[PDB]
Amino acid sequence: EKNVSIVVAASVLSSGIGINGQLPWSISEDLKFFSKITNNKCDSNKKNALIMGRKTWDSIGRRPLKNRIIVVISSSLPQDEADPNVVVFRNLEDSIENLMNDDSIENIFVCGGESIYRDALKDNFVDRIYLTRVALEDIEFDTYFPEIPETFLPVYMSQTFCTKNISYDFMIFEKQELKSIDDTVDLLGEIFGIRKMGNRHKFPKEEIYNTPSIRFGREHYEFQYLDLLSRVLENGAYRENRTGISTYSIFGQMMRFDMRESFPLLTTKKVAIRSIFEELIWFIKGDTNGNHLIEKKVYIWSGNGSKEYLERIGLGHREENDLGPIYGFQWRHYNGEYKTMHDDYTGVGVDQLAKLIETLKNNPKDRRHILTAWNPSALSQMALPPCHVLSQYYVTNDNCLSCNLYQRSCDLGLGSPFNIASYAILTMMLAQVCGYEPGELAIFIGDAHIYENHLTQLKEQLSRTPRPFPQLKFKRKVENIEDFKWEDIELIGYYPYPTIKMDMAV
Amino acid sequence: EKNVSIVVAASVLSSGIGINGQLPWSISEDLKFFSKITNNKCDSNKKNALIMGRKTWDSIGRRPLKNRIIVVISSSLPQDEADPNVVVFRNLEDSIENLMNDDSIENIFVCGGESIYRDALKDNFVDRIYLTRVALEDIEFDTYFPEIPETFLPVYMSQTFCTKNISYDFMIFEKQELKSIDDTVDLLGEIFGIRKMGNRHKFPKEEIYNTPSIRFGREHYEFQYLDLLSRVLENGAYRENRTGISTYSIFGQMMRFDMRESFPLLTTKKVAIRSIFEELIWFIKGDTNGNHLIEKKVYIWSGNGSKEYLERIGLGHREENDLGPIYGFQWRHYNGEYKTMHDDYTGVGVDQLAKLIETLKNNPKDRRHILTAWNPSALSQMALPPCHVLSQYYVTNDNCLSCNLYQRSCDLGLGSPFNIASYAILTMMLAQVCGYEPGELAIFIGDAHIYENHLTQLKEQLSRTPRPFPQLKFKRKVENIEDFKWEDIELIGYYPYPTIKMDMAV
Ligand SMILES: NC(=O)C1=CN([C@@H]2O[C@H](COP(=O)(O)OP(=O)(O)OC[C@H]3O[C@@H](n4cnc5c(N)ncnc54)[C@H](OP(=O)(O)O)[C@@H]3O)[C@@H](O)[C@H]2O)C=CC1
Ligand SMILES: NC(=O)C1=CN([C@@H]2O[C@H](COP(=O)(O)OP(=O)(O)OC[C@H]3O[C@@H](n4cnc5c(N)ncnc54)[C@H](OP(=O)(O)O)[C@@H]3O)[C@@H](O)[C@H]2O)C=CC1
Ligand SMILES: CN(Cc1cnc2nc(N)nc(N)c2n1)c1ccc(C(=O)N[C@@H](CCC(=O)O)C(=O)O)cc1
Ligand SMILES: CN(Cc1cnc2nc(N)nc(N)c2n1)c1ccc(C(=O)N[C@@H](CCC(=O)O)C(=O)O)cc1
Ligand SMILES: N#Cc1ccc(C(=O)O)c(NC(=O)c2ccc(Cc3c[nH]c4nc(N)[nH]c(=O)c34)cc2)c1
Ligand SMILES: N#Cc1ccc(C(=O)O)c(NC(=O)c2ccc(Cc3c[nH]c4nc(N)[nH]c(=O)c34)cc2)c1
Ligand SMILES: O=c1[nH]c(=O)n([C@H]2C[C@H](O)[C@@H](COP(=O)(O)O)O2)cc1F
Ligand SMILES: O=c1[nH]c(=O)n([C@H]2C[C@H](O)[C@@H](COP(=O)(O)O)O2)cc1F
């Protein structure tokens, strides 16, 4: 009685694993993973058995794998005894004799074709599953990995890796069948009420925890957003705000995202990447004219830039979509005397973005790469004060550009994914213009809240197990950061769950 | 063979537990902890045995404890059989008969006096220790808890709690004698180099991890600073900066601190609390004259305000200690045209602090309680750009004031403890002036670094197991936040480790 694990690499949606007797991709790191996971043994005087079908045995050139014993399932192959590293069995059931006898085999790995997988799961021989999810779906498959039976639960999901612009994951599925510290903490929490800080940051209940079976392996960085949603649903205080829609709010949170091997665009919900990009390039150009976004079919600033909203907050003198000095006016003309959105501001104010780029590519190890939008002198003239308030940038020793963002207020339903993707794109643009590679993205949030009309939606979003992050590449190298266009962005391998409509609070 | 646990409450330094036949304190929550930990059983048809000496039996009025069986060690008390909840034994060894026979006893708790503790540890009967560390040391003791033998290791240290201005901790000591996810993550880290983000955030080695035996119980929030030190020592990249002293640096970190039941002043090192307060009140008053700190024997801004340093950074025109528009000039006179430190600035600039107080006590659930110091227009005039760049404040539904701080650059050796204590004191002042209670303190750090001349020192600081945080109370209620004086602050129960001298990089 020893352990049996399926090892498979399948596509993200249709679970395709093969085409015309070969793999539908060429990912070197995945083969290295197969090698390291099938060689992983505990006894130096024992080998691991790799069970595979005959067509799979043909796919690998009918040559043995070092340090391992290959077990070919076939009804026609001669039961040869010349090669001691290759043995043939007539059916999958008889080949599980490695359990009963043959104490020289430690672990068993089912890694054959669809025919072997399907009745290795049907016969209930499989204890574990090592699944490599690959983000390739608009190609042709003829061999699929069967649907994972409900008796398996995911216990690990790695970060998204990238090979030849192809995104992929690593997951573990397990088949389902000291306490003194926990008891002491529970007793202390019973004694002290909300006096014990742990009780103000309670762990989210299972019913609001995305993919609850993954306890110790929540490595995929989309969990940095779903777990924040869960924490707000668990500990969020019900509070009224400037709008008629109350929120559930907490204070002081953070999220980390990798940008080296993936792009942090949420997969549990289709995110409008084009509107995000157009808003970001609108910021970079220094523009505060709200019509330029409406002309490009981007209506995210329509609510805060209407005649009724502007008159209500005391800006009736302002034109229809004249949002005033906001993001992109403090970026390019900080402390600049604002008049209207039609005036010329070339020369006035402090060009924070230009000085930022100059410092990034002239003094990288400087600790002052800071872009701010909080200007107390101009707050009254704004249609809406800056939410993503401050950002800092950091050049690592291996020429990567990381970004930190402090955001005073975060609408986790709508604003948060937009902010994540927007500052990821901005860091990538800065990295290309300065000659670096994208690094990491940290977001520090003050008032993290969920509007009460989003609950039914966000809980729905928590029911969807995440998929690997896509890739975002630039088609050309620009000369100035303002020259980026939507046609220059290629979004590779983005297979999200369907969009979830959520109304914005004005 | 069942479990035996000492339960004791002792002072932090001298380990005193009694005086004149009674306790040297009156902490109700500690008695509730004793009750809940001695009643904690798994079988409803079994009782727990509480072993105590005769003088301790007198201390509790010679009356039984509900649901438990008291075992009095005494050579003179009559071995009575009338009370089935109290039994007398002539020596401690014979009383351990609960192990061999008497299957109706589940757990055993040694909670007697010094005489019982000392030879319960000497006789090697004790498996666990539940220690309540109390921050009271300048009083009289006549009964002490013996030194914990080296065979025990701490596995848990709670947050600091407060009762009647008395700080206390809860610790567990244990006597010393799935892997698939870890293996998969290790293999992925072998495949991908620094491509896997986990390899850029490696867990600190044991040799640089403060109190390494506490793995799952690092609840005490001083660990939020020691763990950041360890993370920098593990992953910090060696980088040169504007000073001649290079650092080991990482990007994007955070620390949380409770302020409801304690004051986050580090105990692993004696921190100059008076200098912190004087700098903070110097900020609040709007002052940039560095001599006012030197006249009060506070020399922390001398290095960045010398004739040589000012001439080197291009401010030779500036007077000796005229630091320029910095902390407290952007607080009280934001965007105000700075001349010298001698001019009158009452009226010029935006008084951010006053508007902050007004918004805090007039619109608490507002999401714009923001105090900034990053002014791109005034950066060139500063002797040093702002390190603690941005701060946000939050009023909870139970009328507590929490604070978030974004700091662009953090000298973990010198600047970080000062920043922690300083923003804690500032939040407390704002809470008193606005009529709230102190909440939580979150610090978000960009470039967190350790200067290379601090290593030997900081490693030393990592060798000291933390002690409970002290308390900080205000003696009077002021009318304006500027009226605070050093004599108004009472620092209760601060018993730190000796100071560690560390030189500042100019
Ligand atoms: N992405 C991934 O992780 C993997 C992908 N693949 C790909 O999948 C494809 C191959 O899979 P697939 O088409 O299913 O072929 P298989 O690898 O499953 O091999 C099938 C052969 O195995 C034998 N066999 C299967 N079931 C039985 C049985 N119940 N009793 C007796 N013999 C049996 C038969 O051999 P015989 O006719 O001689 O009797 C059969 O022809 C290839 O493209 C391969 O590259 C393969 C492995 C892994
Ligand atoms: N902070 C805390 O957690 C606790 C504090 N305390 C405090 O400590 C003080 C009391 O402790 P302490 O002074 O040490 O007195 P003890 O509680 O240890 O009791 C001592 C008595 O126990 C009996 N005894 C002790 N050792 C032996 C032995 N080897 N064989 C037989 N009998 C023995 C003797 O009784 P006899 O003379 O009758 O034979 C002795 O007089 C009190 O102030 C109490 O409040 C007590 C418990 C917990
Ligand atoms: C059965 N098969 C098809 C195949 C391809 N990719 C997969 N990928 C995964 N994640 N899991 C599988 N079962 C899998 N199987 C294989 C198996 C081994 C090799 C192979 O050449 N392995 C070398 C790889 C050496 C390397 O590139 O470092 C080894 O040492 O294991 C190729 C195809
Ligand atoms: C022996 N002793 C002295 C005393 C005082 N504080 C301690 N504190 C600790 N952490 N550990 C001890 N062994 C301890 N012992 C005791 C023991 C019980 C009670 C007592 O009254 N216990 C009630 C407490 C009721 C409560 O306040 O809710 C109980 O239910 O156990 C007082 C003093
Ligand atoms: N699922 C989903 C989904 C699908 C489509 C879209 C889309 O528009 O294509 C979308 N996004 C928004 O609707 C959106 C996003 C970001 C913003 C930014 C903003 C400015 N002012 C704010 N005020 C408040 N309260 N909240 C805010 O988010 C903001 C404003 C609107 C979400
Ligand atoms: N252990 C210990 C210990 C004991 C005594 C003292 C003391 O002075 O009583 C002390 N503190 C400082 O020396 C100190 C603290 C904070 C500051 C703030 C600051 C301004 N400019 C900076 N430049 C750089 N590089 N680093 C900085 O921290 C700053 C400047 C100096 C530490
Ligand atoms: O980038 C943004 N992210 C975001 O979450 N909001 C939401 C947060 C909140 O719902 C509202 C700000 O309201 P207030 O100014 O009162 O904090 O805008 C707005 C942005 F522009
Ligand atoms: O409150 C402070 N906190 C702090 O950490 N520093 C340190 C951080 C850094 O080591 C140095 C200067 O930072 P920089 O070199 O980016 O100007 O001051 C200074 C303060 F005033």
Q: Which two tokens stand for residue A218?
A: 């929540």
In chain B, the residue whose alpha carbon lies closest to the alpha carbon of A255 is B252
For B394, the closest of A184, A251, A366 (CB atoms) is: A251
Q: Which two tokens stand for residue A153?
A: 């639960």
Which of A126, A128, A365, A423 has the most B C-beta neighbours within 10 Å, making it the best mutation to test the interface with B? A365
Phi and psi, residue B404, nearest 5°: -110, 140
What SS3 class is residue B74? coil
Residue of A7, A11, A17, A70 with the most ligand 1 atoms within 8 Å of its CB, for mutation: A17
Asked if residue A28 lies in contact with residue A89, where contact means CB atoms within 8 angstroms, the answer is no
Distance from C-alpha of A10 to C-alpha of A21, rounded to nearest angstrom: 15
Distance from C-alpha of A134 to C-alpha of A471, rounded to nearest angstrom: 12
Residue with tokens 């500042």: B504
For A158, the closest of B29, B188, B194 (CB atoms) is: B188
* Strand A400-411 to A388-395 pairing: antiparallel
CB of B352 closer than 6 A to ligand 8?
A: no
Distance from C-alpha of B173 to C-alpha of B194, rounded to nearest angstrom: 37
Q: H helices within B435-463, ranges in order? A: 455-462
Distance from C-alpha of B264 to C-alpha of B470, rounded to nearest angstrom: 8
Q: What's this structure's resolution in Å? A: 3.0
H-helix or E-strand containing B116? helix B114-122
| Sequential DSSP letters for B37-53 | HHH--S-TT-EEEEEEE
What SS3 class is residue B437? strand
For A392, the closest of B181, B239, B408 (CB atoms) is: B408
Distance from C-alpha of B330 to C-alpha of B336, rounded to nearest angstrom: 8
CA dihedral angle for residue B468, residue B469, residue B475, residue B479, rounded to 10 degrees = -150
Residue with tokens 């995945």: A30
Distance from C-alpha of B103 to C-alpha of A417, rounded to nearest angstrom: 59
Q: Which two tokens stand for residue A406?
A: 């402090």
| Sequential DSSP letters for A386-422 | -SEEEEEEEE-TTSEEEEEEEEEEEETTTHHHHHHHH
Distance from C-alpha of B58 to C-alpha of B36, rounded to nearest angstrom: 22
Q: Which two tokens stand for residue A132?
A: 């490599």
Spell out the SS3 assignment of B339-376. Answer: CCCCCCCCCCCECHHHHHHHHHHHCCCCCCCEEECCCC
Spell out the SS3 assignment of B136-175. Answer: CCCCCCCEECCCCCCCEEEEEECCCEEECCEEECCEEEEE
Residue of A411, A449, A452 with the most ligand 7 atoms within 8 Å of its CB, for mutation: A411
Inter-helix orientation angle B352-362/B415-434, to 10°: 50
Asked if residue B360 lies in contact with residue B393, where contact means CB atoms within 8 angstroms, the answer is yes
Asked if residue B72 lies in contact with residue B87, where contact means CB atoms within 8 angstroms, the answer is yes
CA A421 to chain centroid, in Å, comes to 10
b/e burial code for range B345-359 (CB count within 10 A of at least 16 → b): beeebbbbbebbbeb
* Residues in chain B closer than 8 A to A398 (CB atoms): 194
Distance from C-alpha of B393 to C-alpha of B404, rounded to nearest angstrom: 6
Q: Evaluate the CA torsion angle A284, A286, A290, A296 in order and state its sign.
A: negative
For A254, the closest of B174, B188, B254 (CB atoms) is: B254
Task: Of A404, A420, A406, give the one whose Cα is nearest residue A367.
Answer: A404
Phi and psi, residue A404, nearest 5°: -110, 140
Distance from C-alpha of B173 to C-alpha of B153, rounded to nearest angstrom: 5
What's the CA-to-centroid distance between B15 and ligand 7, angstroms? 52
Which of B31, B39, B390 has the most A C-beta neighbours within 10 Å, making it the best mutation to test the interface with A? B390
CB of B414 closer than 6 A to ligand 6?
A: yes
- Please list, in sequence order, all residues whose beta carbon lies within 8 angstroms of the beta carbon of residue A12, skipping any fewer than 6 positions away: A133, A134, A135, A136, A137, A169, A467, A468, A495
Q: H helices within B407-474, ranges in order? A: 415-434, 455-462
Distance from C-alpha of A189 to C-alpha of A191, rounded to nearest angstrom: 5
H-helix or E-strand containing A114? helix A114-122
Radius of gyration from C-alpha coordinates of chain A: 27
What SS3 class is residue A149? coil
Task: Of B184, B188, B192, give the one whose Cα is nearest residue A5.
Answer: B184
* Strand B237-239 to B247-258 pairing: antiparallel
Q: What DSSP designation does A46 have? A: -
Task: Calculate ∠ Cα A188-A193-A196, nearest 5°.
Answer: 60
**Residue-level length of chain B:** 506
- Please list, in sequence order, all residues whose beta carbon lies within 8 angstroms of the beta carbon of residue A239, skipping any fewer than 6 positions away: A246, A247, A248, A249, A449, B365, B397
Spell out the SS3 assignment of B199-266. Answer: HHCCCCCHHHCCCCCCCCCECCCCHHHHHHHHHHHHHCEEECCCCCCCEEEEEEEEEEEECCCCCCCC
CA A118 to chain centroid, in Å, comes to 30
Distance from C-alpha of A321 to C-alpha of A305, rounded to nearest angstrom: 5
How big is the A-B interface in CB pairs under 8 Å? 231
As to burial, measured by CB atoms within 10 angstroms (0-12 exposed, 13-18 middle, 19+ buried), residue A322 is: buried
* Residues in chain A closer than 8 A to B379 (CB atoms): 368
* Residues in chain B closer than 8 A to A440 (CB atoms): 197, 200, 251-252
What's the CA-to-centroid distance between A132 and ligand 1, angstroms? 18
Alpha carbon nearest to ligand 6 atom 5, residue: B272
Task: Of A435, A340, A344, give the one whose Cα is nearest residue A381.
Answer: A340
Asked if residue A89 lies in contact with residue A59, where contact means CB atoms within 8 angstroms, the answer is no
* Residues in chain A closer than 8 A to B350 (CB atoms): 376-377
Distance from C-alpha of B76 to C-alpha of A365, rounded to nearest angstrom: 76
Distance from C-alpha of A30 to C-alpha of A169, rounded to nearest angstrom: 10
Asked if residue B152 lies in contact with residue B89, where contact means CB atoms within 8 angstroms, the answer is no
What SS3 class is residue A184? helix
CA A81 to chain centroid, in Å, comes to 49
User: Could you give the C-alpha distances from B494 to B22, B158, B502, in angstroms and in order?
Assistant: 24, 17, 21
b/e burial code for range B311-337 (CB count within 10 A of at least 16 → b): eeeebeebbebbbbbbbbbbbbbbbbe
In chain A, the residue whose alpha carbon lies closest to the alpha carbon of B251 is A394
Query: Distance, in angstroms, between B90 CA and closest chain A CA?
Result: 31
H-helix or E-strand containing B297? none
What SS3 class is residue A384? coil
Can you name the residues that pair with B61 across neighbouring β-strands?
Answer: none
Asked if residue A57 lies in contact with residue A180, where contact means CB atoms within 8 angstroms, the answer is no
In chain B, the residue whose alpha carbon lies closest to the alpha carbon of A131 is B184
b/e burial code for range B442-469 (CB count within 10 A of at least 16 → b): bbbbbbbbbbeebeebbeebbebbbbbb
All domains of chain B, ordered by start, with CATH? Answer: 1-176 (3.40.430.10), 177-222 (3.30.572.10), 223-506 (3.30.572.10)
Q: Evaluate the CA torsion angle A359, A365, A368, A373 in order and state its sign.
A: positive
- How many CB atoms neighbour CB A10 within 10 A? 22
Amino acid in position B337: E
Task: Calculate ∠ Cα B458-B459-B463, nearest 5°.
Answer: 115
Q: Which two tokens stand for residue A77?
A: 């192959």
| Sequential DSSP letters for A50-99 | EEEEHHHHHHTTT-PPTTEEEEEE-SSS----S-TTEEEESSTTGGGHHH
Pairwise CB contact (< 8 Å): A198 & B406: no
b/e burial code for range B271-307 (CB count within 10 A of at least 16 → b): bebebbbbbbbbbbbbbbbbbbbbeeebebbbbbbbe
Phi and psi, residue B406, nearest 5°: -100, 125
Pairwise CB contact (< 8 Å): A221 & B197: yes
Strands (E), B16-151: 16-18, 47-53, 68-73, 86-89, 105-110, 128-134, 143-144
In chain B, the residue whose alpha carbon lies closest to the alpha carbon of A365 is B241
Binding site feature residues of B for NADPH: 9, 17, 22, 54-56, 59, 74-76, 113-115, 119, 143
Can you name the residues that pair with B19 across neighbouring β-strands?
Answer: B22
Asked if residue A462 lies in contact with residue A230, where contact means CB atoms within 8 angstroms, the answer is yes
* Residues in chain A closer than 8 A to B40 (CB atoms): 183, 187
Q: H helices within A270-380, ranges in order? A: 273-284, 291-295, 307-312, 352-362
b/e burial code for range A60-81 (CB count within 10 A of at least 16 → b): eeeeebeebbbbbbbeeeeeee
- How many CB atoms neighbour CB A230 within 10 A? 23
H-helix or E-strand containing B447? strand B437-451
